[PDB]
Amino acid sequence: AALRQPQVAELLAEARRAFREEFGAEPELAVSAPGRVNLIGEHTDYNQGLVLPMALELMTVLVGSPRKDGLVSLLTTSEGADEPQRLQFPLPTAQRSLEPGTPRWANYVKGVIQYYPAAPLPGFSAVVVSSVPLGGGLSSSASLEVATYTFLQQLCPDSGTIAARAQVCQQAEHSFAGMPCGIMDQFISLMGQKGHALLIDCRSLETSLVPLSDPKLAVLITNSNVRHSLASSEYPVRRRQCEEVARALGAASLREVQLEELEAARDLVSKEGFRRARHVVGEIRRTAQAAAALRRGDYRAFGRLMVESHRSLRDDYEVSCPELDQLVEAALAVPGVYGSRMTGGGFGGCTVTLLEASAAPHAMRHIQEHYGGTATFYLSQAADGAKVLCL
Amino acid sequence: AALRQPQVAELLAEARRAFREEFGAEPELAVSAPGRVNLIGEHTDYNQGLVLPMALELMTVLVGSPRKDGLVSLLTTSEGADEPQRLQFPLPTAQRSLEPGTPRWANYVKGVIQYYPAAPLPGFSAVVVSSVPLGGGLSSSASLEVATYTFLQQLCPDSGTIAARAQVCQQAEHSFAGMPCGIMDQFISLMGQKGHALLIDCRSLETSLVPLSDPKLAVLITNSNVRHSLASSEYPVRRRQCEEVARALGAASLREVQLEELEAARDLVSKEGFRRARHVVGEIRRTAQAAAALRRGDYRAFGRLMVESHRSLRDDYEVSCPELDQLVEAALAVPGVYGSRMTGGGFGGCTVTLLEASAAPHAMRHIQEHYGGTATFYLSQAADGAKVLCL
Ligand SMILES: O=C1CCCC2=C1[C@H](c1[nH]ncc1Cl)N=C(Nc1nc3ccccc3o1)N2
Ligand SMILES: O=C1CCCC2=C1[C@H](c1[nH]ncc1Cl)N=C(Nc1nc3ccccc3o1)N2
Ligand SMILES: OC[C@H]1O[C@H](O)[C@H](O)[C@@H](O)[C@H]1O
Ligand SMILES: OC[C@H]1O[C@H](O)[C@H](O)[C@@H](O)[C@H]1O
Ligand code: NA
Ligand code: NA
């Protein structure tokens, strides 16, 4: 049995109740921003690569009102979130910028306020609710950053592009959460359309909408319900390793390298740098091919490319873990499954599986029964991006 | 020189004021939908071809409220909307549907009601305001259709994708305006983003958002302020010729016919038929080449393709007119202009001109001086598509 995904009207109702209770009046404003699953194109976004994510119906909802006093007052019901559930801080000023602190969850909101490009931004009271499982690799943090950005636009309209908004949320993640992410998770939370995955070119920031609206195809998300500590620590190590191979080959990024130059340059780089760069160069090519394949309705070829994405992440990039590998092999053993692999950063989180709609009940019975741990499952249709909810 | 383009805040305040006066109270709901200019890819959309439009900062805004009485009550403030500018009608039933009638402007709204796919749709009171010049060839009608659709979604949510919404609006234009249009104008009004052109594959309905992020480059729109009576009568005639020469070549559409194949099948079709298909088949190739030139940043190559497109429309497709031709030749004579061409259906309306921002003032003086009639100008940037506006 797959996990009932609370609809937007439900998260919003919980967010109003906690707000009405907390601040003594109805919130004036509200927004939603989703999480995301990457179908293929892992560890390519900070390498100016290609990724193929879709937005989920798992989302973050902000409700709030402007204040007159220049303070920010937050409450989150998110029961994963670190204590306290409440936090207040002053707006940043010419005299004093905000700094990351405790609790961790509020760093995502502080960062987006700090880099919000439009002025004058008023103080606000807000409640944050989320159905995105925290640390589960479905971009909880990007959903919060983008929900915050969308809210701030209701207080104080911005004048730039949708990429610029993604880059603000990215800057918040870099400076306030110490996590040097690529643009994928912010971009998909912002640009997602119902019935479509997004081919994102992280060099040009061109995006292509790729239909998934075929009723006999299902995308299954399996949460391992594990997050090894490597998760936080090893991400910035892989990024600097890639940047060092590009610099050693005289390339602005690995986007500009192909496997043949890399083969030929292999004595300019560590054995390990070589293997990371070979994952990225291949995964860029796989994502381009997967996108054409999906557009063609060729799921088996999409499925092959997903499994080769997994192997490359497990062996060359080394960002899988026993739990993800076990979930992937288990899913591949099931008839009707085109392919399976880890999605997001790795070291835990979720696999994504493409399978026959009709094969999905058997798939969950098998994977759960064939998992050492306790899996969770989401049956996911491609959702819209961030939007305003008119209260 | 350039006509001022009201911002959404100012259109809302005008619409609220008209709504308060007309219906006795503040409206509850608001939406906006933009007009468009086609950069290249003219008369290809109904040939399952490629188009490269951008949304404009010219837009239509509906404000309104649900009713209990199953009546629709409309008022428009739009400059040359035909009389009456206010009317009331009951919602359609399965028993009886709406029909196109007087006035012409309300036909766009009636059509979208009739074909709106979700139920139950309540009655409503709405005011319609627009900065898109009625019949100026910037898709005033698509902006009204998409604004109406977006407004009905606030009364009664739909559950299809964005593409289906464009098709409902297309069907309203076919049945209620008698205009057998392609998908371009509805698609761009829905899916436009600030700082992006939209590459639409009208065969697959795949779309790519292509960034316009060179502030040295500008797009000048020149309204001829002329509409010949050919524009009504002659559009369905060109569409019919395209269909005949496709059947006559045993192809599903002219999208399936390569230029070199067409050029060697001169004897299968009428000389006229042949010239129509040569425009269409060539324009599909020019559109792909123009996208690649945008992505490369080659605005000189983009400009030359714009001029080939104009010549093709003028001589092969015969949908230009003396005023458009004078305005194009006038623009190309100005230093800093990469290219110029008629945009939209033809037989009047606007040219689009790609130029150095710094040259726009000289262009507007040279073009007006060298134009037999009275030119209007817009310097529009790529705008956002259809939105909800929270009152
Ligand atoms: O500490 C880390 C490192 C890994 C990434 C990470 C956090 C962290 C977190 N995980 N569990 C408890 C907490 Cl606090 N918050 C989020 N996302 C997050 N999305 C949220 C949405 C609403 C409210 C709180 C949220 O936190 N994401
Ligand atoms: O009669 C034709 C044939 C060509 C297409 C065409 C019309 C026609 C129109 N042109 N001039 C006066 C009027 Cl009434 N209305 C619109 N668009 C239109 N967009 C509108 C937006 C808001 C209000 C009225 C509108 O009408 N478009
Ligand atoms: O593809 C791996 C993925 O990992 C994390 O989720 C980052 O937030 C993204 O930017 C991306 O790098
Ligand atoms: O490209 C010419 C253009 O003409 C009209 O404006 C139609 O609305 C569009 O569908 C398209 O066919
Ligand atoms: Na188990
Ligand atoms: Na003149």
PDB file of N, CA, C and O in Angstrom, chain A residues 73-126:
ATOM      1  N   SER A  73       8.543  36.104  12.283  1.00  0.00           N
ATOM      2  CA  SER A  73       8.046  35.135  13.275  1.00  0.00           C
ATOM      3  C   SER A  73       7.531  33.902  12.523  1.00  0.00           C
ATOM      4  O   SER A  73       6.556  34.029  11.790  1.00  0.00           O
ATOM      5  N   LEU A  74       8.219  32.767  12.697  1.00  0.00           N
ATOM      6  CA  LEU A  74       7.990  31.477  12.009  1.00  0.00           C
ATOM      7  C   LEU A  74       7.495  30.429  13.008  1.00  0.00           C
ATOM      8  O   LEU A  74       7.937  30.470  14.161  1.00  0.00           O
ATOM      9  N   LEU A  75       6.642  29.514  12.545  1.00  0.00           N
ATOM     10  CA  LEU A  75       6.263  28.258  13.234  1.00  0.00           C
ATOM     11  C   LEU A  75       6.239  27.179  12.156  1.00  0.00           C
ATOM     12  O   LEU A  75       5.726  27.441  11.071  1.00  0.00           O
ATOM     13  N   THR A  76       6.761  25.998  12.435  1.00  0.00           N
ATOM     14  CA  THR A  76       6.630  24.836  11.528  1.00  0.00           C
ATOM     15  C   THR A  76       5.980  23.710  12.326  1.00  0.00           C
ATOM     16  O   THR A  76       6.333  23.586  13.483  1.00  0.00           O
ATOM     17  N   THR A  77       5.045  22.966  11.727  1.00  0.00           N
ATOM     18  CA  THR A  77       4.441  21.730  12.292  1.00  0.00           C
ATOM     19  C   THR A  77       5.276  20.506  11.897  1.00  0.00           C
ATOM     20  O   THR A  77       5.061  19.425  12.463  1.00  0.00           O
ATOM     21  N   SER A  78       6.170  20.655  10.925  1.00  0.00           N
ATOM     22  CA  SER A  78       7.053  19.566  10.440  1.00  0.00           C
ATOM     23  C   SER A  78       7.680  18.907  11.664  1.00  0.00           C
ATOM     24  O   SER A  78       8.322  19.623  12.453  1.00  0.00           O
ATOM     25  N   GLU A  79       7.422  17.618  11.871  1.00  0.00           N
ATOM     26  CA  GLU A  79       7.721  16.930  13.160  1.00  0.00           C
ATOM     27  C   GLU A  79       9.099  16.250  13.044  1.00  0.00           C
ATOM     28  O   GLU A  79       9.655  15.907  14.113  1.00  0.00           O
ATOM     29  N   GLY A  80       9.651  16.110  11.825  1.00  0.00           N
ATOM     30  CA  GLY A  80      11.099  15.920  11.598  1.00  0.00           C
ATOM     31  C   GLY A  80      11.932  17.146  12.013  1.00  0.00           C
ATOM     32  O   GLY A  80      13.079  16.950  12.482  1.00  0.00           O
ATOM     33  N   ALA A  81      11.416  18.376  11.875  1.00  0.00           N
ATOM     34  CA  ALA A  81      12.210  19.621  12.059  1.00  0.00           C
ATOM     35  C   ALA A  81      12.868  19.639  13.445  1.00  0.00           C
ATOM     36  O   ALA A  81      12.243  19.182  14.378  1.00  0.00           O
ATOM     37  N   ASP A  82      14.077  20.190  13.567  1.00  0.00           N
ATOM     38  CA  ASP A  82      14.814  20.290  14.854  1.00  0.00           C
ATOM     39  C   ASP A  82      14.145  21.377  15.713  1.00  0.00           C
ATOM     40  O   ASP A  82      13.438  22.240  15.139  1.00  0.00           O
ATOM     41  N   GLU A  83      14.290  21.275  17.044  1.00  0.00           N
ATOM     42  CA  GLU A  83      13.718  22.209  18.044  1.00  0.00           C
ATOM     43  C   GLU A  83      14.540  23.491  18.103  1.00  0.00           C
ATOM     44  O   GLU A  83      15.750  23.493  17.927  1.00  0.00           O
ATOM     45  N   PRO A  84      13.902  24.632  18.408  1.00  0.00           N
ATOM     46  CA  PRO A  84      12.448  24.691  18.571  1.00  0.00           C
ATOM     47  C   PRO A  84      11.698  24.801  17.232  1.00  0.00           C
ATOM     48  O   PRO A  84      12.297  25.160  16.233  1.00  0.00           O
ATOM     49  N   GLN A  85      10.400  24.522  17.286  1.00  0.00           N
ATOM     50  CA  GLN A  85       9.448  24.585  16.154  1.00  0.00           C
ATOM     51  C   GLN A  85       9.210  26.037  15.768  1.00  0.00           C
ATOM     52  O   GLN A  85       8.689  26.271  14.680  1.00  0.00           O
ATOM     53  N   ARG A  86       9.497  26.952  16.678  1.00  0.00           N
ATOM     54  CA  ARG A  86       9.271  28.403  16.493  1.00  0.00           C
ATOM     55  C   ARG A  86      10.586  29.148  16.500  1.00  0.00           C
ATOM     56  O   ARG A  86      11.464  28.769  17.245  1.00  0.00           O
ATOM     57  N   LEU A  87      10.640  30.232  15.750  1.00  0.00           N
ATOM     58  CA  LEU A  87      11.825  31.100  15.696  1.00  0.00           C
ATOM     59  C   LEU A  87      11.391  32.497  15.283  1.00  0.00           C
ATOM     60  O   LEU A  87      10.563  32.608  14.370  1.00  0.00           O
ATOM     61  N   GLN A  88      11.984  33.506  15.914  1.00  0.00           N
ATOM     62  CA  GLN A  88      11.857  34.916  15.488  1.00  0.00           C
ATOM     63  C   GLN A  88      13.248  35.522  15.310  1.00  0.00           C
ATOM     64  O   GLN A  88      14.144  35.168  16.035  1.00  0.00           O
ATOM     65  N   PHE A  89      13.386  36.406  14.334  1.00  0.00           N
ATOM     66  CA  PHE A  89      14.625  37.153  14.036  1.00  0.00           C
ATOM     67  C   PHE A  89      14.260  38.453  13.330  1.00  0.00           C
ATOM     68  O   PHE A  89      13.206  38.577  12.714  1.00  0.00           O
ATOM     69  N   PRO A  90      15.125  39.474  13.403  1.00  0.00           N
ATOM     70  CA  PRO A  90      14.874  40.712  12.691  1.00  0.00           C
ATOM     71  C   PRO A  90      15.188  40.489  11.216  1.00  0.00           C
ATOM     72  O   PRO A  90      16.012  39.660  10.896  1.00  0.00           O
ATOM     73  N   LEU A  91      14.515  41.251  10.361  1.00  0.00           N
ATOM     74  CA  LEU A  91      14.885  41.398   8.932  1.00  0.00           C
ATOM     75  C   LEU A  91      16.342  41.820   8.863  1.00  0.00           C
ATOM     76  O   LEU A  91      16.811  42.599   9.681  1.00  0.00           O
ATOM     77  N   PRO A  92      17.082  41.401   7.827  1.00  0.00           N
ATOM     78  CA  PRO A  92      18.430  41.922   7.621  1.00  0.00           C
ATOM     79  C   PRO A  92      18.336  43.414   7.305  1.00  0.00           C
ATOM     80  O   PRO A  92      17.315  43.854   6.840  1.00  0.00           O
ATOM     81  N   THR A  93      19.404  44.151   7.559  1.00  0.00           N
ATOM     82  CA  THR A  93      19.473  45.603   7.318  1.00  0.00           C
ATOM     83  C   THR A  93      20.842  45.951   6.747  1.00  0.00           C
ATOM     84  O   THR A  93      21.741  45.065   6.744  1.00  0.00           O
ATOM     85  N   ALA A  94      21.003  47.213   6.364  1.00  0.00           N
ATOM     86  CA  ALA A  94      22.291  47.777   5.916  1.00  0.00           C
ATOM     87  C   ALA A  94      23.315  47.626   7.048  1.00  0.00           C
ATOM     88  O   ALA A  94      24.495  47.555   6.749  1.00  0.00           O
ATOM     89  N   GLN A  95      22.881  47.582   8.306  1.00  0.00           N
ATOM     90  CA  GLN A  95      23.814  47.528   9.452  1.00  0.00           C
ATOM     91  C   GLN A  95      24.204  46.071   9.701  1.00  0.00           C
ATOM     92  O   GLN A  95      25.286  45.830  10.200  1.00  0.00           O
ATOM     93  N   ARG A  96      23.360  45.113   9.363  1.00  0.00           N
ATOM     94  CA  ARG A  96      23.546  43.747   9.901  1.00  0.00           C
ATOM     95  C   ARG A  96      22.812  42.716   9.048  1.00  0.00           C
ATOM     96  O   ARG A  96      21.594  42.740   9.019  1.00  0.00           O
ATOM     97  N   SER A  97      23.552  41.794   8.450  1.00  0.00           N
ATOM     98  CA  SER A  97      22.991  40.640   7.711  1.00  0.00           C
ATOM     99  C   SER A  97      22.638  39.509   8.684  1.00  0.00           C
ATOM    100  O   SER A  97      23.236  39.417   9.739  1.00  0.00           O
ATOM    101  N   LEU A  98      21.704  38.657   8.287  1.00  0.00           N
ATOM    102  CA  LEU A  98      21.363  37.425   9.015  1.00  0.00           C
ATOM    103  C   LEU A  98      22.533  36.462   8.887  1.00  0.00           C
ATOM    104  O   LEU A  98      23.311  36.619   7.944  1.00  0.00           O
ATOM    105  N   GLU A  99      22.617  35.506   9.807  1.00  0.00           N
ATOM    106  CA  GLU A  99      23.669  34.457   9.843  1.00  0.00           C
ATOM    107  C   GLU A  99      22.942  33.142  10.019  1.00  0.00           C
ATOM    108  O   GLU A  99      21.893  33.127  10.635  1.00  0.00           O
ATOM    109  N   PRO A 100      23.483  32.016   9.531  1.00  0.00           N
ATOM    110  CA  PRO A 100      22.884  30.718   9.816  1.00  0.00           C
ATOM    111  C   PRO A 100      23.022  30.432  11.309  1.00  0.00           C
ATOM    112  O   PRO A 100      23.971  30.883  11.860  1.00  0.00           O
ATOM    113  N   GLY A 101      22.065  29.724  11.908  1.00  0.00           N
ATOM    114  CA  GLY A 101      22.154  29.256  13.307  1.00  0.00           C
ATOM    115  C   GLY A 101      21.296  28.028  13.540  1.00  0.00           C
ATOM    116  O   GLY A 101      21.241  27.178  12.629  1.00  0.00           O
ATOM    117  N   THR A 102      20.677  27.981  14.727  1.00  0.00           N
ATOM    118  CA  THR A 102      19.722  26.973  15.248  1.00  0.00           C
ATOM    119  C   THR A 102      18.369  27.640  15.360  1.00  0.00           C
ATOM    120  O   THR A 102      18.304  28.806  15.689  1.00  0.00           O
ATOM    121  N   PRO A 103      17.247  26.958  15.089  1.00  0.00           N
ATOM    122  CA  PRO A 103      17.259  25.618  14.524  1.00  0.00           C
ATOM    123  C   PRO A 103      17.654  25.663  13.039  1.00  0.00           C
ATOM    124  O   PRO A 103      17.507  26.694  12.419  1.00  0.00           O
ATOM    125  N   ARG A 104      18.171  24.540  12.546  1.00  0.00           N
ATOM    126  CA  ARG A 104      18.662  24.317  11.168  1.00  0.00           C
ATOM    127  C   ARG A 104      17.555  24.639  10.168  1.00  0.00           C
ATOM    128  O   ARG A 104      17.853  25.259   9.137  1.00  0.00           O
ATOM    129  N   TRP A 105      16.332  24.197  10.436  1.00  0.00           N
ATOM    130  CA  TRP A 105      15.218  24.292   9.451  1.00  0.00           C
ATOM    131  C   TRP A 105      14.989  25.747   9.044  1.00  0.00           C
ATOM    132  O   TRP A 105      14.647  25.976   7.897  1.00  0.00           O
ATOM    133  N   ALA A 106      15.190  26.695   9.939  1.00  0.00           N
ATOM    134  CA  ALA A 106      14.928  28.130   9.683  1.00  0.00           C
ATOM    135  C   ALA A 106      16.048  28.743   8.822  1.00  0.00           C
ATOM    136  O   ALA A 106      15.813  29.786   8.211  1.00  0.00           O
ATOM    137  N   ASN A 107      17.214  28.098   8.735  1.00  0.00           N
ATOM    138  CA  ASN A 107      18.322  28.612   7.895  1.00  0.00           C
ATOM    139  C   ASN A 107      17.853  28.750   6.455  1.00  0.00           C
ATOM    140  O   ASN A 107      18.237  29.709   5.833  1.00  0.00           O
ATOM    141  N   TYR A 108      17.050  27.823   5.950  1.00  0.00           N
ATOM    142  CA  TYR A 108      16.530  27.888   4.559  1.00  0.00           C
ATOM    143  C   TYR A 108      15.684  29.149   4.369  1.00  0.00           C
ATOM    144  O   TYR A 108      15.809  29.786   3.302  1.00  0.00           O
ATOM    145  N   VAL A 109      14.879  29.524   5.366  1.00  0.00           N
ATOM    146  CA  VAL A 109      14.007  30.721   5.255  1.00  0.00           C
ATOM    147  C   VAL A 109      14.860  31.979   5.400  1.00  0.00           C
ATOM    148  O   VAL A 109      14.669  32.898   4.610  1.00  0.00           O
ATOM    149  N   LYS A 110      15.752  32.030   6.378  1.00  0.00           N
ATOM    150  CA  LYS A 110      16.670  33.185   6.571  1.00  0.00           C
ATOM    151  C   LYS A 110      17.452  33.491   5.289  1.00  0.00           C
ATOM    152  O   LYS A 110      17.529  34.681   4.891  1.00  0.00           O
ATOM    153  N   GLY A 111      18.071  32.464   4.705  1.00  0.00           N
ATOM    154  CA  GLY A 111      18.851  32.597   3.466  1.00  0.00           C
ATOM    155  C   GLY A 111      18.018  33.200   2.340  1.00  0.00           C
ATOM    156  O   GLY A 111      18.491  34.115   1.647  1.00  0.00           O
ATOM    157  N   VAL A 112      16.796  32.740   2.126  1.00  0.00           N
ATOM    158  CA  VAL A 112      16.017  33.290   0.988  1.00  0.00           C
ATOM    159  C   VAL A 112      15.705  34.771   1.250  1.00  0.00           C
ATOM    160  O   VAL A 112      15.852  35.571   0.327  1.00  0.00           O
ATOM    161  N   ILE A 113      15.356  35.143   2.478  1.00  0.00           N
ATOM    162  CA  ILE A 113      15.114  36.565   2.850  1.00  0.00           C
ATOM    163  C   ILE A 113      16.369  37.407   2.577  1.00  0.00           C
ATOM    164  O   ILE A 113      16.254  38.520   1.978  1.00  0.00           O
ATOM    165  N   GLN A 114      17.523  36.910   3.010  1.00  0.00           N
ATOM    166  CA  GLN A 114      18.791  37.645   2.891  1.00  0.00           C
ATOM    167  C   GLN A 114      19.069  37.967   1.414  1.00  0.00           C
ATOM    168  O   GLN A 114      19.497  39.114   1.136  1.00  0.00           O
ATOM    169  N   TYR A 115      18.850  37.028   0.486  1.00  0.00           N
ATOM    170  CA  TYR A 115      19.219  37.234  -0.937  1.00  0.00           C
ATOM    171  C   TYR A 115      18.023  37.666  -1.774  1.00  0.00           C
ATOM    172  O   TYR A 115      18.200  37.854  -2.980  1.00  0.00           O
ATOM    173  N   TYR A 116      16.849  37.832  -1.179  1.00  0.00           N
ATOM    174  CA  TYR A 116      15.641  38.236  -1.943  1.00  0.00           C
ATOM    175  C   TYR A 116      16.002  39.537  -2.642  1.00  0.00           C
ATOM    176  O   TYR A 116      16.455  40.474  -2.013  1.00  0.00           O
ATOM    177  N   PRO A 117      15.918  39.635  -3.973  1.00  0.00           N
ATOM    178  CA  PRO A 117      16.433  40.815  -4.650  1.00  0.00           C
ATOM    179  C   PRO A 117      15.540  42.060  -4.599  1.00  0.00           C
ATOM    180  O   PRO A 117      15.979  43.033  -5.080  1.00  0.00           O
ATOM    181  N   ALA A 118      14.319  42.028  -4.084  1.00  0.00           N
ATOM    182  CA  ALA A 118      13.420  43.209  -4.200  1.00  0.00           C
ATOM    183  C   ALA A 118      13.229  43.839  -2.824  1.00  0.00           C
ATOM    184  O   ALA A 118      13.454  43.138  -1.839  1.00  0.00           O
ATOM    185  N   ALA A 119      12.888  45.126  -2.775  1.00  0.00           N
ATOM    186  CA  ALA A 119      12.819  45.963  -1.547  1.00  0.00           C
ATOM    187  C   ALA A 119      11.723  47.015  -1.710  1.00  0.00           C
ATOM    188  O   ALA A 119      11.455  47.408  -2.829  1.00  0.00           O
ATOM    189  N   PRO A 120      11.067  47.559  -0.662  1.00  0.00           N
ATOM    190  CA  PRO A 120      11.263  47.172   0.731  1.00  0.00           C
ATOM    191  C   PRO A 120      10.434  45.923   1.088  1.00  0.00           C
ATOM    192  O   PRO A 120       9.240  45.823   0.779  1.00  0.00           O
ATOM    193  N   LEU A 121      11.109  44.983   1.734  1.00  0.00           N
ATOM    194  CA  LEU A 121      10.499  43.727   2.191  1.00  0.00           C
ATOM    195  C   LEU A 121      10.021  43.955   3.605  1.00  0.00           C
ATOM    196  O   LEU A 121      10.824  44.394   4.411  1.00  0.00           O
ATOM    197  N   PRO A 122       8.716  43.766   3.916  1.00  0.00           N
ATOM    198  CA  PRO A 122       8.233  43.913   5.285  1.00  0.00           C
ATOM    199  C   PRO A 122       8.548  42.658   6.104  1.00  0.00           C
ATOM    200  O   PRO A 122       8.796  41.599   5.542  1.00  0.00           O
ATOM    201  N   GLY A 123       8.507  42.808   7.418  1.00  0.00           N
ATOM    202  CA  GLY A 123       8.416  41.678   8.358  1.00  0.00           C
ATOM    203  C   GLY A 123       7.165  40.861   8.106  1.00  0.00           C
ATOM    204  O   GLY A 123       6.264  41.367   7.436  1.00  0.00           O
ATOM    205  N   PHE A 124       7.110  39.629   8.602  1.00  0.00           N
ATOM    206  CA  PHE A 124       5.940  38.751   8.387  1.00  0.00           C
ATOM    207  C   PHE A 124       5.879  37.690   9.480  1.00  0.00           C
ATOM    208  O   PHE A 124       6.912  37.353  10.072  1.00  0.00           O
ATOM    209  N   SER A 125       4.663  37.211   9.726  1.00  0.00           N
ATOM    210  CA  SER A 125       4.349  36.021  10.530  1.00  0.00           C
ATOM    211  C   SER A 125       3.992  34.930   9.525  1.00  0.00           C
ATOM    212  O   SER A 125       3.290  35.251   8.529  1.00  0.00           O
ATOM    213  N   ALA A 126       4.470  33.708   9.736  1.00  0.00           N
ATOM    214  CA  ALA A 126       4.200  32.592   8.806  1.00  0.00           C
ATOM    215  C   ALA A 126       4.207  31.252   9.522  1.00  0.00           C
ATOM    216  O   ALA A 126       4.981  31.101  10.478  1.00  0.00           O
TER     217      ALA A 126
END
